[PDB]
Amino acid sequence: QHWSYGLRPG
């Protein structure tokens, strides 16, 4: 995973 999760995309 590497996405705009529950924070910034990173």
Side-chain angles (χ1 to χ4, degrees), residues 2-10:
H2 169 203
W3 126 266
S4 213
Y5 197 59
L7 63 147
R8 58 134 206 236

